[PDB]
Design a protein around this ligand. Sequence first.
Ligand SMILES: [Mg+2]
Ligand SMILES: [Mg+2]
Ligand SMILES: [Mg+2]
Ligand SMILES: [Mg+2]
Ligand SMILES: [Mg+2]
Ligand SMILES: [Mg+2]
Ligand SMILES: [Mg+2]
Ligand SMILES: [Mg+2]
Ligand SMILES: [Mg+2]
Ligand SMILES: [Mg+2]
Ligand SMILES: [Mg+2]
Ligand SMILES: [Mg+2]
Ligand SMILES: [Mg+2]
Ligand SMILES: [Mg+2]
Ligand SMILES: [Mg+2]
Ligand SMILES: [Mg+2]
Ligand SMILES: [Mg+2]
Ligand SMILES: [Mg+2]
Ligand SMILES: [Mg+2]
Ligand SMILES: [Mg+2]
Ligand SMILES: [Mg+2]
Ligand SMILES: [Mg+2]
Ligand SMILES: [Mg+2]
Ligand SMILES: [Mg+2]
Ligand SMILES: [Mg+2]
Ligand SMILES: [Mg+2]
Ligand SMILES: [Mg+2]
Ligand SMILES: [Mg+2]
Ligand SMILES: [Mg+2]
Ligand SMILES: [Mg+2]
Ligand SMILES: [Mg+2]
Ligand SMILES: [Mg+2]
Ligand SMILES: [Mg+2]
Ligand SMILES: [Mg+2]
Ligand SMILES: [Mg+2]
Ligand SMILES: [Mg+2]
Ligand SMILES: [Mg+2]
Ligand SMILES: [Mg+2]
Ligand SMILES: [Mg+2]
Ligand SMILES: [Mg+2]
Ligand SMILES: [Mg+2]
Ligand SMILES: [Mg+2]
Ligand SMILES: [Mg+2]
Ligand SMILES: [Mg+2]
Ligand SMILES: [Mg+2]
Ligand SMILES: [Mg+2]
Ligand SMILES: [Mg+2]
Ligand SMILES: [Mg+2]
Ligand SMILES: [Mg+2]
Ligand SMILES: [Mg+2]
Ligand SMILES: [Mg+2]
Ligand SMILES: [Mg+2]
Ligand SMILES: [Mg+2]
Ligand SMILES: [Mg+2]
Ligand SMILES: [Mg+2]
Ligand SMILES: [Mg+2]
Ligand SMILES: [Mg+2]
Ligand SMILES: [Mg+2]
Ligand SMILES: [Mg+2]
Ligand SMILES: [Mg+2]
Ligand SMILES: [Mg+2]
Ligand SMILES: [Mg+2]
Ligand SMILES: [Mg+2]
Ligand SMILES: [Mg+2]
Ligand SMILES: [Mg+2]
Ligand SMILES: [Mg+2]
Ligand SMILES: [Mg+2]
Ligand SMILES: [Mg+2]
Ligand SMILES: [Mg+2]
Ligand SMILES: [Mg+2]
Ligand SMILES: [Mg+2]
Ligand SMILES: [Mg+2]
Ligand SMILES: [Mg+2]
Ligand SMILES: [Mg+2]
Ligand SMILES: [Mg+2]
Ligand SMILES: [Mg+2]
Ligand SMILES: [Mg+2]
Ligand SMILES: [Mg+2]
Ligand SMILES: [Mg+2]
Ligand SMILES: [Mg+2]
Ligand SMILES: [Mg+2]
Ligand SMILES: [Mg+2]
Ligand SMILES: [Mg+2]
Ligand SMILES: [Mg+2]
Ligand SMILES: [Mg+2]
Ligand SMILES: [Mg+2]
Ligand SMILES: [Mg+2]
Ligand SMILES: [Mg+2]
Ligand SMILES: [Mg+2]
Ligand SMILES: [Mg+2]
Ligand SMILES: [Mg+2]
Ligand SMILES: [Mg+2]
Ligand SMILES: [Mg+2]
Ligand SMILES: [Mg+2]
Ligand SMILES: [Mg+2]
Ligand SMILES: [Mg+2]
Ligand SMILES: [Mg+2]
Ligand SMILES: [Mg+2]
Ligand SMILES: [Mg+2]
Ligand SMILES: [Mg+2]
Ligand SMILES: [Mg+2]
Ligand SMILES: [Mg+2]
Ligand SMILES: [Mg+2]
Ligand SMILES: [Mg+2]
Ligand SMILES: [Mg+2]
Ligand SMILES: [Mg+2]
Ligand SMILES: [Mg+2]
Ligand SMILES: [Mg+2]
Ligand SMILES: [Mg+2]
Ligand SMILES: [Mg+2]
Ligand SMILES: [Mg+2]
Ligand SMILES: [Mg+2]
Ligand SMILES: [Mg+2]
Ligand SMILES: [Mg+2]
Ligand SMILES: [Mg+2]
Length: 252
Amino acid sequence: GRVIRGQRKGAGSVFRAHVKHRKGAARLRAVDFAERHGYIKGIVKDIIHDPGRGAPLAKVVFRDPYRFKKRTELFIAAEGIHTGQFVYCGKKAQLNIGNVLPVGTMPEGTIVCCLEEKPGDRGKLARASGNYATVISHNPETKKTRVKLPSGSKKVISSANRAVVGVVAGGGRIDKPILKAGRAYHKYKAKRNCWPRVRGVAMNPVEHPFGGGNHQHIGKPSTIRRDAPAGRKVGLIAARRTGRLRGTKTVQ
RNA sequence: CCACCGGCCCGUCUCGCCCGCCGCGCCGGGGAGGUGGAGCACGAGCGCACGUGUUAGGACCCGAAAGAUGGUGAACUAUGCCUGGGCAGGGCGAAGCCAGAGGAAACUCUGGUGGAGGUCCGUAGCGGUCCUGACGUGCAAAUCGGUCGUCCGACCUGGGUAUAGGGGCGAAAGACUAAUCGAACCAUCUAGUAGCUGGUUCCCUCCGAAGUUUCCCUCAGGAUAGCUGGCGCUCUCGCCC
RNA sequence: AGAACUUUGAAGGCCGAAGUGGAGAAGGGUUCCAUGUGAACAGCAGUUGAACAUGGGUCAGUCGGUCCUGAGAGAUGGGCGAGCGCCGUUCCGAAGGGACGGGCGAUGGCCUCCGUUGCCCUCGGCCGAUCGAAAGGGAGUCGGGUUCAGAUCCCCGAAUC
RNA sequence: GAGAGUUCUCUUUUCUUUGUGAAGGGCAGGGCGCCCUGGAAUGGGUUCGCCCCGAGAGAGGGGCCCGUGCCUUGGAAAGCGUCGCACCUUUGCUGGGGUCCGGUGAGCUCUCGCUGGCCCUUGAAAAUCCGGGGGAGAGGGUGUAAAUCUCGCGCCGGGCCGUACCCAUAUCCGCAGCAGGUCUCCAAGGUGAACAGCCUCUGGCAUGUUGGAACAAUGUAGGUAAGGGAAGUCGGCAAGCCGGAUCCGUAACUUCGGGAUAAGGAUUGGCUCUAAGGGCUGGCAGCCGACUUAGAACUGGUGCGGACCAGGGGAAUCCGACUGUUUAAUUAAAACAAAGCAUCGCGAAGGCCCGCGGCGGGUGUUGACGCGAUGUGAUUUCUGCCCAGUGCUCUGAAUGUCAAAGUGAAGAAAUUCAAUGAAGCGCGGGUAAACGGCGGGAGUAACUAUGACUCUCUUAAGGUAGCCAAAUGCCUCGUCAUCUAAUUAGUGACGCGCAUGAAUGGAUGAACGAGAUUCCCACUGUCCCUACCUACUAUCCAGCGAAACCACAGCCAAGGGAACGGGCUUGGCGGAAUCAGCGGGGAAAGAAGACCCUGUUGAGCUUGACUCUAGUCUGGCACGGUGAAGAGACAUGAGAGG
RNA sequence: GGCGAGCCCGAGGGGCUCUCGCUUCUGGCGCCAAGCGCCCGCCCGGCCGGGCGCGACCCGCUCCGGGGACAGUGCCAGGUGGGGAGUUUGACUGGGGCGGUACACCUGUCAAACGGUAACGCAGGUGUCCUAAGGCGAGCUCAGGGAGGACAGAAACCUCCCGUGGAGCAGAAGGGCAAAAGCUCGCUUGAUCUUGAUUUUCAGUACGAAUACAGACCGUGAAAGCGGGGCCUCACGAUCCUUCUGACCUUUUGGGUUUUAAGCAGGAGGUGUCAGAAAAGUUACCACAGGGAUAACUGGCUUGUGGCGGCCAAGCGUUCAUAGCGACGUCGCUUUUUGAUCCUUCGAUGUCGGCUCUUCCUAUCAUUGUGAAGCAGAAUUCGCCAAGCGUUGGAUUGUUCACCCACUAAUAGGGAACGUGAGCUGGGUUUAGACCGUCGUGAGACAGGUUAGUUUUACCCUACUGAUGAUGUGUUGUUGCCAUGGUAAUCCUGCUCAGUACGAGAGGAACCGCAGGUUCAGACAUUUGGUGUAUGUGCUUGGCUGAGGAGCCAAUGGGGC
Ligand SMILES: [Mg+2]
Ligand SMILES: [Mg+2]
Ligand SMILES: [Mg+2]
Ligand SMILES: [Mg+2]
Ligand SMILES: [Mg+2]
Ligand SMILES: [Mg+2]
Ligand SMILES: [Mg+2]
Ligand SMILES: [Mg+2]
Ligand SMILES: [Mg+2]
Ligand SMILES: [Mg+2]
Ligand SMILES: [Mg+2]
Ligand SMILES: [Mg+2]
Ligand SMILES: [Mg+2]
Ligand SMILES: [Mg+2]
Ligand SMILES: [Mg+2]
Ligand SMILES: [Mg+2]
Ligand SMILES: [Mg+2]
Ligand SMILES: [Mg+2]
Ligand SMILES: [Mg+2]
Ligand SMILES: [Mg+2]
Ligand SMILES: [Mg+2]
Ligand SMILES: [Mg+2]
Ligand SMILES: [Mg+2]
Ligand SMILES: [Mg+2]
Ligand SMILES: [Mg+2]
Ligand SMILES: [Mg+2]
Ligand SMILES: [Mg+2]
Ligand SMILES: [Mg+2]
Ligand SMILES: [Mg+2]
Ligand SMILES: [Mg+2]
Ligand SMILES: [Mg+2]
Ligand SMILES: [Mg+2]
Ligand SMILES: [Mg+2]
Ligand SMILES: [Mg+2]
Ligand SMILES: [Mg+2]
Ligand SMILES: [Mg+2]
Ligand SMILES: [Mg+2]
Ligand SMILES: [Mg+2]
Ligand SMILES: [Mg+2]
Ligand SMILES: [Mg+2]
Ligand SMILES: [Mg+2]
Ligand SMILES: [Mg+2]
Ligand SMILES: [Mg+2]
Ligand SMILES: [Mg+2]
Ligand SMILES: [Mg+2]
Ligand SMILES: [Mg+2]
Ligand SMILES: [Mg+2]
Ligand SMILES: [Mg+2]
Ligand SMILES: [Mg+2]
Ligand SMILES: [Mg+2]
Ligand SMILES: [Mg+2]
Ligand SMILES: [Mg+2]
Ligand SMILES: [Mg+2]
Ligand SMILES: [Mg+2]
Ligand SMILES: [Mg+2]
Ligand SMILES: [Mg+2]
Ligand SMILES: [Mg+2]
Ligand SMILES: [Mg+2]
Ligand SMILES: [Mg+2]
Ligand SMILES: [Mg+2]
Ligand SMILES: [Mg+2]
Ligand SMILES: [Mg+2]
Ligand SMILES: [Mg+2]
Ligand SMILES: [Mg+2]
Ligand SMILES: [Mg+2]
Ligand SMILES: [Mg+2]
Ligand SMILES: [Mg+2]
Ligand SMILES: [Mg+2]
Ligand SMILES: [Mg+2]
Ligand SMILES: [Mg+2]
Ligand SMILES: [Mg+2]
Ligand SMILES: [Mg+2]
Ligand SMILES: [Mg+2]
Ligand SMILES: [Mg+2]
Ligand SMILES: [Mg+2]
Ligand SMILES: [Mg+2]
Ligand SMILES: [Mg+2]
Ligand SMILES: [Mg+2]
Ligand SMILES: [Mg+2]
Ligand SMILES: [Mg+2]
Ligand SMILES: [Mg+2]
Ligand SMILES: [Mg+2]
Ligand SMILES: [Mg+2]
Ligand SMILES: [Mg+2]
Ligand SMILES: [Mg+2]
Ligand SMILES: [Mg+2]
Ligand SMILES: [Mg+2]
Ligand SMILES: [Mg+2]
Ligand SMILES: [Mg+2]
Ligand SMILES: [Mg+2]
Ligand SMILES: [Mg+2]
Ligand SMILES: [Mg+2]
Ligand SMILES: [Mg+2]
Ligand SMILES: [Mg+2]
Ligand SMILES: [Mg+2]
Ligand SMILES: [Mg+2]
Ligand SMILES: [Mg+2]
Ligand SMILES: [Mg+2]
Ligand SMILES: [Mg+2]
Ligand SMILES: [Mg+2]
Ligand SMILES: [Mg+2]
Ligand SMILES: [Mg+2]
Ligand SMILES: [Mg+2]
Ligand SMILES: [Mg+2]
Ligand SMILES: [Mg+2]
Ligand SMILES: [Mg+2]
Ligand SMILES: [Mg+2]
Ligand SMILES: [Mg+2]
Ligand SMILES: [Mg+2]
Ligand SMILES: [Mg+2]
Ligand SMILES: [Mg+2]
Ligand SMILES: [Mg+2]
Ligand SMILES: [Mg+2]
Ligand SMILES: [Mg+2]
Ligand SMILES: [Mg+2]
């Protein structure tokens, strides 16, 4: 009869993201004439650590092509850039690490990251630390571009959206074991209040469909369909196949 | 007034025949027999008052576990966030560094330095294992004395702030949410219902029981019959039957 | 009048600086001080008291609030809602009323010269009103003396924003 | 130097005090990742530690910032101890000494600066203010003087609000002057490693809502006890032993880090000594002061951590890796959590959720090394077999069932019939680190049995590797061996194990458990077997003074009785009022039994119990408009076919 | 626009088709226009102050992109939906649940010679079957047995005889039936219509079943007659709704026709909890109103069971029934076991065991005095009067119980609300946490196992223990009796007896006497040991009084006496 923990997550009362010490949203520059009919050069001031994120944030200063003012943007620092390196943003920019340019111009097999789903989405895909997307196809007519995302999915996107070249800095971040609960607590304290993660079979039937019984067992098939109501989707959600995997999943 | 027989009216079943025409018809009316009616067969009701009995009203009085509506609480406690404060002393000795010795080389060994740890003894702080110690109408609606675990941390704490009741919060004890939490508090519905307990106030006189039949989701109950009381009413003795 | 509980002196002791000391914040609101009585309150008593009655006591440019935002709360634009209203805070808004300068015109002061008013031209992103800390940010006062009760406040002297 | 205390004896002795605020200037001191000359290796100068050098080291010469330190204006005339002249509601003023000479320090507190370490933790914004780049503009124009001044002065103003006191074992909350709770600063001397414990100074206090007399039992705290030493008890419960430091010695096991203060030994006082461990001045010598170590001699009735302070230990089993959290007010755990190991969904018109409402909100200042939902729970090795059933998922309008809406037909119409049929269901495949499961007979070894081996029914497969009378075994106090004089206990082994078993996790397993259990050593009043002593009661008195409970009240035996009387019957018998204990009775008090049953009385929870619903997936109707190509059916006239 | 690149024709050049402009070694700056061509007012054709355009091109109907007649929105329909909400969890019952239906209907007994009469009393049944197993009429007689006949046999078929029901009548039983109610044969649906009254449980209500009639149409036999189901006792169902049948019926609302609907009567579709709701489980997290109408304690009635005795005497006992046992049978006591019933207790009697302590019982283990043996002695066994005195120390278990070691004269059995929780302990049972095994999909359950889990109050009355007292003797004191009540002593070892009696030996006593010892009781401190604050004395740690001396403080500082 009581709302479960996974159901209380959507209320946003105490489960809000700790966004106090966040430096800024990681987004690219706005598409304009100086970007679609040439390129502009900017200077990287410094890279900083964003709490709750493994990818560093590089501050880049560009010169406004219309007003006398310097524009500061926060990009995702690709691995292999240093303070003082000139970063070029535009259509006819040279293919180098750090420079952003539309995917319709780069050749096949280009390892890029921080791209956009739609032209103007301003850097939404492949933003985690050490991830990249691989361009595999091109279409001159009916402009489309096939990319392979870090999840292995091959998605077709527009040929006008941009992507910075290179892999995100901070790779291999998951190779280190947390090695104790204190480091996990300090990690999740900057992200959000979701760490304790009490098992469902430990509590009572009032707070979870799995709790109860004199023996700490589930009693019901953990595989639950997609049509289950709120507060009922627990355990595996529409598990098409369970158990230890045998090779590659190869699912589209 | 009682019992019976017969008679009349209405609804039905059987049997057959007769009469009428503002129009000669799957139109009307009539008889003799058997049944059903809360009927007729010289009518007694109406209005007011009183008494008893049943019933609906909170309905002889007092009493729930619960349900709904609308509002108040995060000054305790649980959890986030923001902004501040605090944690005596000793023990073990991680990386790195220096020097010396051994060795053909690889390299090894030794003495220091170095000061890491969700490290150890231990104070303040934070909690409360045992004595199942004292109190147990107490200092106290949860305290006190020894003995305890941890004490650089997943640490303790102040103020501000967010989440409000089938909701919040929960390192999960269904624990906490203002001494109340397996669903808070406040007011109303509400004099909620109870086949269940308790109580139910002056005298005298007369009569005076039942715990049994049948039925009911009936077995701690009710209906029915029986037992009882009251109001009468219709007659009979009172002057060889 | 009344003495073990008040006062003074002496002796013997405790708290022994993580106090039984000196100050503060929250909270209390006159409890602080002086005088006076002793039925009630103080778990016995009382000449005593934080009780009673009367009268006093809190003085700031430089102590803090007032200013600023933090987590967060919040009106208008707009949307929803039968409705009190609610969600939403930059979203779907014609959401800058101010200024540098120049020109025209009017007015006032000793109309020499300046200060204003009305209009025209040029320029000007609010990161959206507003609230949110007596421990955060936040310019600038220290020494001595003074009362029965005040001290960085009162007086003297010396400074500063 | 001033004042004070002791002086039977000694002590130039002991105690209190001995000053410079904001602001401005100068000078010491500290820091520099700041400049110039010149460039090194035989590498250099440097820290407690690192660090730095051709991108310029050592050395020499300069600059900048803080200067809370020193002197000076303030500043000695105020302030404070001293000996005095008027004076006891007129009390001010005298003069001397205070701004005297110094030193040391792993000393405590505060501050400043340098450097290092910690990370899947990067540790706040805004208001005010300043500097720089740019050069739109303004200014007298010359032996007369303007544009501007962030320079030295001078004038004026700074409004409003709070300001006492407690801040506490007596001014706050807890019904109160309640051993309870409540956030901060300052904090000395001795012992001592220390803010441990104990004793004093500055400063407070009457012993915590009363005193007098006595020291009976019982009680509450405290300490000993001859001989035995756990023989008491369910249990070593409580109590008791060691407890600090220095010097030797430290096992099994292990993840090689630990175990570990393992275990087991020796010393510890007092007063005289010796040696070592430093700085400063001059061209190897002279003075100045801190307490540390080591050794030896002498000596006290073997006493020396002399009070206080303060780890019993070892051998094993079970569980949990550990640190951490947990039921405020009966549980601290084996429970929860934890890193680690796996699985599932999601590429944003998305996944999981909130919401009565909006293309409203959380994750999201987010993008697969992310988010959301589960299981197991250090490391190592292992992860066995079953998709039959219940769940999850995927596919072809070949294929059954199938609602509205739409089409055709019959009928005067309502209406009826028929054709087609979206999801879903049904069919088929996959998935068990999804829920779960893992049987039963018969014949066979030259002593025999048990049984190598084999045949057969069953459904989806018949317990593999492991482990055990376990926290899991009814029979059971299972059998064997050890531990004991004796063992329902403990350990090891045996294993058709009613009913162990593999992420329902199984087997191990160093360290750690205020976790449960067994044994051994020292230890003690737990005991044999009790006794004595101290403080506070209890006791009597002075003063003040309730509550629980109360049908009337209280001596027993037997009988009957509602089957256990105190009162009834028969007997025993029966003198007031009282004090201190006592706990046999009053079927004693605290509560309309939390146990069992009834109620056609409720609540929490679950599901393949009944009836519904948010939500979610599909189909139809409008928003919802234009063009091309193509498929199926209906009606039309005509040509082939059975 | 060529400061550019072209594929081409081509002598100069042209554009069919096109790339398009000028920021990529470097942690610097970059804005509020230079120039050019024109237009004004002021210095005689000049200076100063201003304005426009090009620089920086023109035109246009979405600000730029990505989807798009889809997605989404409103309405409707169908799936899924304990995520959420509401409600239910039959009754009887020797407590409840499980078991069973004694819940609806029959047969026999219970049932006591009318009818009626109960239990979870006994022995059994029913929810069907039959177009014949109904009706009529006729014919025949069955089960079994005896004697014969080819295969033929215990049983094949034929014939004779006996054959009162011993067979059959659909099925459980009872009653009934012989030219029959049984078997066979032939026609047949009277197993069809209609209105009443009556019988059975009965309230004399209904349903079901049944009886006798009456009114029409039929069957059958020739006929009298029989038949409106089964030879009789059971074989079955209200309201509302649905369906069917009949009128040449009634109403369909202002009046007509028709479809439809409603209406009358009787047949069916069911209430098996059967006089008829539509209904799963758990709560050890539990709550409320009650019940001793109703279990888990004790007590009380009986003792089946348990224990303890007696009688008979077949036999054991080498002989021999009864020294000692004593079967087959049978008669008694006990509530120290369990069980049966539920009488008091539900506004509570605190429910295991252990520790401490008192008293009682005897069915006597030992001790005192005795009798009998297969009692030579010793050691033993069976009884008598006999409860005065004892009936222990430990290992494991919560244990009652049970086993073991050792001691001992003996290590006997019990009662007092299964004595004793305002005396204690909390070891287990028996709350809430949690683990394992089994069961259940689940919540959860287990007289299955293992861990941690608040033990409250006396100051009242009585009883008991002790102390003041009271009554009466005129007052007081001293010395004295006891009526009454209590009552305390018990056991064992060593020596002489005595290596004697006895006994073939082995072995081996007893009375008197002498030393003692165990338990218990009364005291007592000379000696020994405890206690110790005479805070008695003398050392000693830290601090303090200036230092010696004398001292004090550290909750009686510690320790030697
Ligand atoms: Mg967990
Ligand atoms: Mg739980
Ligand atoms: Mg649930
Ligand atoms: Mg199961
Ligand atoms: Mg009421
Ligand atoms: Mg309800
Ligand atoms: Mg509400
Ligand atoms: Mg709070
Ligand atoms: Mg630690
Ligand atoms: Mg250790
Ligand atoms: Mg502590
Ligand atoms: Mg405590
Ligand atoms: Mg506590
Ligand atoms: Mg405990
Ligand atoms: Mg206690
Ligand atoms: Mg007490
Ligand atoms: Mg401790
Ligand atoms: Mg410890
Ligand atoms: Mg520790
Ligand atoms: Mg509700
Ligand atoms: Mg509470
Ligand atoms: Mg409610
Ligand atoms: Mg009432
Ligand atoms: Mg009845
Ligand atoms: Mg009558
Ligand atoms: Mg005094
Ligand atoms: Mg003192
Ligand atoms: Mg301090
Ligand atoms: Mg203090
Ligand atoms: Mg006074
Ligand atoms: Mg008083
Ligand atoms: Mg006062
Ligand atoms: Mg007053
Ligand atoms: Mg002033
Ligand atoms: Mg201020
Ligand atoms: Mg709002
Ligand atoms: Mg509006
Ligand atoms: Mg403000
Ligand atoms: Mg002053
Ligand atoms: Mg003051
Ligand atoms: Mg100064
Ligand atoms: Mg110093
Ligand atoms: Mg003040
Ligand atoms: Mg207090
Ligand atoms: Mg306190
Ligand atoms: Mg000190
Ligand atoms: Mg020292
Ligand atoms: Mg006193
Ligand atoms: Mg007090
Ligand atoms: Mg002793
Ligand atoms: Mg001794
Ligand atoms: Mg010993
Ligand atoms: Mg022992
Ligand atoms: Mg035991
Ligand atoms: Mg202990
Ligand atoms: Mg060993
Ligand atoms: Mg060890
Ligand atoms: Mg010397
Ligand atoms: Mg643990
Ligand atoms: Mg917590
Ligand atoms: Mg506890
Ligand atoms: Mg979203
Ligand atoms: Mg693991
Ligand atoms: Mg497996
Ligand atoms: Mg399959
Ligand atoms: Mg249609
Ligand atoms: Mg054989
Ligand atoms: Mg096996
Ligand atoms: Mg083992
Ligand atoms: Mg033992
Ligand atoms: Mg199993
Ligand atoms: Mg098994
Ligand atoms: Mg001792
Ligand atoms: Mg009596
Ligand atoms: Mg009795
Ligand atoms: Mg009696
Ligand atoms: Mg009584
Ligand atoms: Mg009487
Ligand atoms: Mg009487
Ligand atoms: Mg008394
Ligand atoms: Mg008592
Ligand atoms: Mg009751
Ligand atoms: Mg009932
Ligand atoms: Mg509840
Ligand atoms: Mg567009
Ligand atoms: Mg429900
Ligand atoms: Mg019942
Ligand atoms: Mg009779
Ligand atoms: Mg009869
Ligand atoms: Mg016949
Ligand atoms: Mg029969
Ligand atoms: Mg018969
Ligand atoms: Mg007839
Ligand atoms: Mg019935
Ligand atoms: Mg229920
Ligand atoms: Mg629970
Ligand atoms: Mg009864
Ligand atoms: Mg009973
Ligand atoms: Mg009681
Ligand atoms: Mg009692
Ligand atoms: Mg006796
Ligand atoms: Mg008892
Ligand atoms: Mg227990
Ligand atoms: Mg329990
Ligand atoms: Mg002889
Ligand atoms: Mg002889
Ligand atoms: Mg004695
Ligand atoms: Mg003596
Ligand atoms: Mg002595
Ligand atoms: Mg002494
Ligand atoms: Mg001394
Ligand atoms: Mg001395
Ligand atoms: Mg003290
Ligand atoms: Mg002593
Ligand atoms: Mg002694």
